[PDB]
């Protein structure tokens, strides 16, 4: 068989020029779109504000206009999904993860509009959902869409354009090219069998996707925490322990995200109305909290920098943590079109900080600075739950730019994935495509 | 399908034992990775303490230089040829191939021969990196623990062996991320699913890295401070630099292989005429390492110096040409030493050169050569060895200028592209091919 290898080696990394020029166009597109979704969600969350500022004086009128303005968006959200593509609901990656293994479909003619405008309304309303997966999925579909258009054959031009697309997606969502490429080659890919995916294409994809972003959002970052302090060697063990904490909690959260999916399902029994209704219900509760207590609502970013700086009293943190687990569980387990990736970055950040503070003074000799453990634990949930430490770390890194902390970030992240496996956790994203890919049969 | 649901729900469950091993392996590849680093130092140093001791007399100096070097080189090639002709060359291909069960992992042999061998080939100061040399000491250390505690399965095998190669490249550049990425992008079986435990590889790298840090904290390998940023209307200049590397990447790939043939004659496999031509080149290194330091040695020393723009354009061109040659000589001559690092040094020099031309051909971009240096520092690792993703994440960890990440990719990928588009090949695979093919024909 080695008589085969020698042949392959000498042939390695020769991807069809055409598959390439396409990863490039796909990228450019997933980019332009990735931006438009970003800009849109903004415009909305803003109007909603421009409307509270316009009812300033009257309070319960305010709280009402808040709730409704939100609820109305949420409804228009769930709806579009349920009435035109029940897949756009949930994160948005599993249906791509599975679409990679040819175990799910890529109906772009549908899911494009429904995931965009859908989430563009679910997020625009300000629910605890990220543009995370939502952009990934808009991604893949855009790839398949160009695939079909210029009609390209082969499993290579299929898996490729579809996988580069998902990546170019996660890239423009966090302006983190490396983390995108790494998400594919670590999570998205077929996690149980060699695949014909062109990594050189994926790159060109991410590259274009990222240029586009940069072209529209330069002069500012998503997260900015400035160069935090360094992390002494006799300090690393505290990151193993924080890594442990996430590892045990990672699975638990994984249950709640699935369970709540069942439980909440009753409350509408698949009925488009009682659903879209319970939709506007949660949606509204978001507008309301997004005002009465902003931390508990919205994506999560806003408060990231604020928590890393140590501006939230310990207590305040605990509240925000608990209040978030809940609101994130609600919005996501309730099949609303929106990611849970970002909200997890926000969750870890808060837990990490908390840990920080306890350490920051339980060991005055270490000269600790909570903010480090925040950066450490910011992709820790993305580790213990979704189980892709390598992508978590390289994501955090690109966003928080504190490479000095890289060692503690890993010892935490890995320390997590470890305790997670050691306690039965599972790739939250796979634990979804399972249930899904199952029920399709189960429904037989 | 129905199988899938089963697999998914079972994902990422690597045998606790395979893990606790990746951890010990790592600790070991670490301790060793360091000792090799410390050793090569001690030597390059004595050699100096000996020139300082013959200060006055010049041709006596130049001689003591050449010989002290040549003697090490000889003791180098020898050990290899007389006890493990595989320690010669980089050291990765025999691990790359060892991963596909197309080559062997004789650790009881290659450990001492690669260590002390290179610890003498590098200690003498030849244009060779501790790059692959450490990777290979790595893998072998994994297989060694594998055998010792005797673990079965293809997973317990491929894993400890692959984590080991990674923990290796990690302690060689103190770059954990780049190590993990080297495996999952270059080392791992390129054309067929494999049973490699990435969670293990990590634990491996982690331990390997702690060890390093425990012995080399308070200083970096490369330090270039926060360079300037890179404007969008500036990115195209990185595509063009990426093109330049892409065309040259294959060419260099030929020379590294060809020179391997050519130089082979000059000893015809004969342990003596080889070990002799060995001390020949080795000596030429001590000599140049003194008369013109840039042209010799690993390459690091001059990296920072070239990024700062301290070498006149001309001076760069010289150092480039002089380096292609000396790197080709030492590596194509089957001496036990990597060519990974020497390529980092090469790109850095080419990138800078490009820089300077740009730095003034476009006074309106407010350029700063040093950026293109960081950009092109892992550009050869891209156009030649073809692993842009590991190159980039390596440079990043070493030069810590994430701001430049976009230009670094547009260059790197821009290279791999022009390289493929011109027939280049994974220099490391283009070796295991030759190896594997000849080995039978």
């Amino acid at each position: 068989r080695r008589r085969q290898l020698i042949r392959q080696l000498l042939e390695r990394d020769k991807t069809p020029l055409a598959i390439l020029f396409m990863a490039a166009v796909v990228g450019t597109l997933v980019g332009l779109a990735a931006v438009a979704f970003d800009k849109g969600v903004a415009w909305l969350q803003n109007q909603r504000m421009g409307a509270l500022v316009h009812t300033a004086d009257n309070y319960p009128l305010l709280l009402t206009v808040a709730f409704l303005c939100s609820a109305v968006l949420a409804m228009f959200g769930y709806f579009l999904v349920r009435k035109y593509a029940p897949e756009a609901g949930g994160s948005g990656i599993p249906e791509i993860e599975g679409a990679l293994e040819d175990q799910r479909p890529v109906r772009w003619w549908r899911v494009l509009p429904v995931k965009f405008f859908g989430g563009l309304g679910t997020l625009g309303g300000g629910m605890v959902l990220g543009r995370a997966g939502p952009t990934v999925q808009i991604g893949g579909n855009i790839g398949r869409m160009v695939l079909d258009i210029f009609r390209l054959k082969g499993d290579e031009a299929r898996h490729t354009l579809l996988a580069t697309g998902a990546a170019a997606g996660l890239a423009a969502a966090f302006n983190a090219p490396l983390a995108g490429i790494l998400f594919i080659i670590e999570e998205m890919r077929p996690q149980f069998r060699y695949t014909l995916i062109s990594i050189k294409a994926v790159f060109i994809g991410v590259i274009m996707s990222t240029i586009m972003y940069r072209i529209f959002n330069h002069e500012v970052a998503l997260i900015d925490v400035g160069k935090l302090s360094d992390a002494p060697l006799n300090t690393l063990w505290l990151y193993l322990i924080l890594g442990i904490i996430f590892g045990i909690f990672g699975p638990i959260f994984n249950k709640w995200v699935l369970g709540m999916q069942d439980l909440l399902h009753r409350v509408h029994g698949g009925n488009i109305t009682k659903w879209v209704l319970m939709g506007g219900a949660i949606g509204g509760l978001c507008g309301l909290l997004g005002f009465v207590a902003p931390a508990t609502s919205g994506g999560g970013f806003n408060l990231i920098p604020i928590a890393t700086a140590g501006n939230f009293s310990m207590g305040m943190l605990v509240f925000i943590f608990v209040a978030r687990v809940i609101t994130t569980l609600l919005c996501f387990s309730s099949g609303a079109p929106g990611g849970i990736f970002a909200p997890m970055l926000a969750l870890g950040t808060v837990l990490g900080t908390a840990f920080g503070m306890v350490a920051v003074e339980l060991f005055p000799q270490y000269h600790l600075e909570a903010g480090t453990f925040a950066i450490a634990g910011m992709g820790a949930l993305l580790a213990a739950s979704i189980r892709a430490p390598l992508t978590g770390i390289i994501l955090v890194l690109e966003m928080t730019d504190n490479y000095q902390l890289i060692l503690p970030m890993i010892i935490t992240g890995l320390g997590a994935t470890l305790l997670a496996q050691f306690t039965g956790g599972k790739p939250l994203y796979s634990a979804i495509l399972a249930r899904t890919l199952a029920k399709q049969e189960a429904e037989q | 399908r129905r199988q899938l649901i089963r697999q998914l729900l079972e994902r990422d469950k690597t045998p606790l034992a395979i893990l606790f091993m990746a951890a010990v392996v790592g600790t070991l590849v670490g301790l060793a990775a360091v000792a090799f680093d410390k050793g090569v130092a001690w030597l390059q140093n004595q050699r100096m303490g000996a020139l300082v001791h013959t200060a006055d007399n010049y041709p006596l100096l130049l001689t003591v230089a050449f010989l002290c070097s040549a003697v090490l080189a000889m003791f180098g090639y020898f050990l290899v040829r007389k006890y493990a002709p595989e320690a010669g060359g980089s050291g990765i291909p025999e691990i790359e191939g060892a991963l596909e069960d197309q080559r062997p992992v004789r650790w009881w042999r290659v450990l001492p021969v690669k260590f002390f061998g290179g610890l003498g080939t590098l200690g003498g100061g030849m244009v060779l990196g501790r790059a692959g040399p450490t990777v290979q000491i790595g893998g072998n250390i994994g297989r060694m623990v594998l055998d010792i505690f005797r673990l079965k399965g293809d997973e317990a095998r491929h894993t400890l062996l692959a984590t080991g190669a990674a923990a290796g490249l990690a302690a060689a550049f103190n770059a954990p991320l780049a190590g993990i990425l080297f495996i999952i992008e270059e080392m791992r079986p390129q054309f067929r699913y494999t049973l490699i435990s990435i969670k293990a590889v990590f634990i491996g790298v982690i331990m390997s890295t702690i060890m390093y840090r425990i012995f080399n904290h308070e200083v970096a390998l490369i330090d270039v401070g926060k360079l300037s940023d890179a404007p969008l209307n500036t990115l195209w200049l990185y595509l063009i630099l990426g093109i330049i590397f892409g065309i040259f990447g294959p060419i260099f790939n030929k020379w590294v292989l060809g020179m391997q043939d050519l130089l082979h004659r000059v000893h015809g496999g004969n342990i003596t005429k080889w070990v002799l031509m060995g001390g020949a080149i080795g000596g030429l290194c001590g000599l140049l390492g003194f008369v013109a330091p840039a042209t010799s040695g690993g390459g690091f020393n001059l990296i920072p110096i070239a990024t700062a723009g301290n070498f006149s354009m001309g001076m760069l061109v010289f150092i480039f040409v002089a380096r292609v040659i000396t790197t080709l000589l030492c590596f194509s001559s089957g001496a036990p030493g990597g060519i990974f690092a020497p390529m980092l040094a090469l790109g850095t020099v080419l990138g800078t050169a490009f820089g300077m031309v740009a730095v003034e051909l476009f006074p309106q971009y407010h350029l700063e050569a040093g950026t293109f240096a960081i950009a092109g520092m892992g550009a050869l690792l891209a156009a030649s060895i073809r692993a842009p993703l590991t190159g980039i994440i390596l440079v990043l960890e070493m030069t810590d200028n994430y701001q430049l990440i976009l230009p670094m990719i547009i260059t790197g990928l821009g290279a791999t592209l022009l390289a493929q588009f011109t027939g280049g090949k994974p220099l490391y695979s283009a070796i295991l091919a030759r190896t594997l093919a000849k080995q039978e024909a």
Partner: antibody
Framework: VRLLESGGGLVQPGGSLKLSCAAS????????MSWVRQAPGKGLKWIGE????????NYTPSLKDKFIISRDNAKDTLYLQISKVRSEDTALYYC??????????????WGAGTTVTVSS | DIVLTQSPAIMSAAPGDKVTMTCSAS?????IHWYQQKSGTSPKRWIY???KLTSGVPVRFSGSGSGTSYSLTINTMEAEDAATYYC?????????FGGGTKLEILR
């Protein structure tokens, strides 16, 4: 890295003087700074330390505002405010930059020192 | 807070001579440090983390110990070792200091 300190002098018991540390030679931030003091031919004692973002100040066990350590990361200077000056405070005050290897912090680079003489 | 107790309060030795002094901890400690203080001069950091010589410390210098007792040692004590060493710790906050040991020359 040079550490120059000023402000030492004669003071009325009860008074309250302010000592300064002028740092030349290193990114003053990223660093911790602390005051150690040595009584007239006697042991060295640690007054206190203060980080970069000035968000953490610790002092050896002593009455609230017995000491006020502060830092201006815009002049790279470290200050020490001593109150209700007694006789014990008659000592040699040293400022130093804190740094470590493993994480068991040491007083990296010290400074010349300034004398505080407390007398009527 | 730990009480570092430097063993010999004083002592004398002749150039070219091995010398050892101590540091006794009121409790456990880890990786202590030693500073050399030249009469009328601002404290210089010598050994650190029980042993490491600071970039410049004469090689004849070393010392160490552990648990609850460390030491400074000079193998062949030259002249330029006229001063006082203070063993300081900070493994346990707040950091403390030994009463020092005075290295006086015998002649």
């Amino acid at each position: 890295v040079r550490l120059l300190e000023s402000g030492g002098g004669l003071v009325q018991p009860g008074g309250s003087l302010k000592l300064s540390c002028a740092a030349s030679g290193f990114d003053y931030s990223r660093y911790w700074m602390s005051w150690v003091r040595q009584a007239p031919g006697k042991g060295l004692k640690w007054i206190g330390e203060i980080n970069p973002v000035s968000s953490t100040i610790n002092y050896t066990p002593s009455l609230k505002d017995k000491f006020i350590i502060s830092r201006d990361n815009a002049k790279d200077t470290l200050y020490l405010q001593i109150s209700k000056v007694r006789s014990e405070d008659t000592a040699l005050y040293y400022c130093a930059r804190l740094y470590y290897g493993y994480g068991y912090w040491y007083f990296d680079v010290w400074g010349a020192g300034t004398t505080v003489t407390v007398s009527s | 807070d730990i009480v570092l107790t430097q063993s010999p309060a004083i002592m004398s030795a002749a150039p070219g001579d091995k010398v050892t002094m101590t540091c006794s901890a009121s409790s456990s400690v880890s990786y202590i440090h030693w500073y050399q203080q030249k009469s009328g001069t601002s404290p210089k950091r010598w050994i650190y983390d029980t042993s490491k010589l600071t970039s410049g410390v004469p090689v004849r210098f070393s010392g160490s110990g552990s648990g609850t007792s460390y030491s400074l040692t000079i193998n062949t004590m030259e002249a330029e070792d006229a001063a006082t060493y203070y063993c300081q710790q900070w493994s346990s906050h707040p950091q403390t200091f030994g009463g020092g040991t005075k290295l006086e020359i015998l002649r």
